[PDB]
Design a binder for this molecule. Sequence first.
Ligand SMILES: O=C(O)c1csc(COc2ccccc2Cl)n1
Length: 133
Amino acid sequence: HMCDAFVGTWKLVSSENFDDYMKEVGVGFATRKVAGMAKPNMIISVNGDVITIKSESTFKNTEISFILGQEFDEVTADDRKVKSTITLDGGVLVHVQKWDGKSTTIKRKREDDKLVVECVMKGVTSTRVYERA
Ligand SMILES: O=C(O)c1csc(COc2ccccc2Cl)n1
């Protein structure tokens, strides 16, 4: 019953500061423009201890499966090769990505009927809000 309130199909409904977050991460112009247009659907499922998060969009379909606290290799939608660890901290899914001596964190939280995604790199934060599909 780990992650129950996250499981489902979610659709992006608002974004703030994502272009700047992507700039901070190092994403180039053309990828920022096309990625920034996307309205992904995020599909979260759990089977035993394994959590799967899929994102589907016209930019780039992704899928990660993981066990909380157990590092895995991830190729991000912007083509970074990162080492990721996802944990639950006080009901918040915390997804840390390490690459080339850098770090970024993606937090996912249930707030009312929304799933709120906060992406932080150095001093730059982007907030992306999803609704049930
Ligand atoms: O909500 C997510 O899954 C999520 C937020 S940030 C991310 C990985 O980073 C990118 C993804 C697409 C374009 C540019 C970047 Cl930097 N995934």
